[PDB]
């Protein structure tokens with residue numbers, strides 16, 4: 001069951017650029033009691049991803065309605081949305097391509113350092129685009145360990161995020177998160193936690209830190225739209241004691 005361009009479809013044209021070059025973006029949302037959590041955030045993250053990938057579309061009002069009706073049906077689960085540049089275009093060229101495709105579907109902690117480092121590219125940073133082959137490789141290595149998630153670094157060694165979640169770590173009253181201007185996805189839950197931490201008593205800083213710098217934290221917290229927050233017990237050969245920040249934002253995140 002897929003809703004593609006306003007009607008149920010099981011298959012998609014092979015010529016679609018999402019299939020050809022993973023040319024597009026996507027978002028995975030939590031559905032609770034027939035409602036999409038942070039619906040507005042999901043639509044806004046789709047618009048910015050479309051903006052930087054130069055994908056022009058105006059079906060936002062129609063897309064919103066569809067997410068809401070699909071969420072009312074599913075009641076409890078996950079809602080996935082994919083937007084691609086559509087068919088067409090000569091080779092890698094965007095010329096004569098379009099119109100854009102929309103696809104919807106609904107469905108019902110220890111860290112290990114990842115041996116796979118994320119490439120650096122400002123033009124693709126932050127965007128939840130479809131080129132997630134680095135995440136597929138990281139996941140494969142992660143499964144060779146007994147960890148639940150992975151600590152992923154930059155090609156230069158900077159702590160960036162996890163495989164499918166963002167990272168926060170804190171010492172005292174200061175909370176830290178890696179700047180996502182060169183790599184990683186700027187999560188919706190990440191941005192939501194930043195809003196909470198900003199108005200709160202904790203101090204929040206967006207840093208560029210090495211592994212050793214982050215391993216000196218009193219606590220570490222993992223996040224994404226589906227968890228939505230998870231407490232971290234260890235990161236390889238370094239155990240964590242408190243879960244204060246986690247106890248703080250968790251009720252506020254759910």
Ligand SMILES: *Cc1c(COP(=O)(O)O)cnc(C)c1O
Pocket residue numbers: 028128135161162163164165166184185186187188189190223224225226
């Ligand atoms: C989707 C994603 C996240 C989390 O995004 P949220 O919008 O907060 O759910 C984190 N890392 C990667 C690589 C992702 O694809």
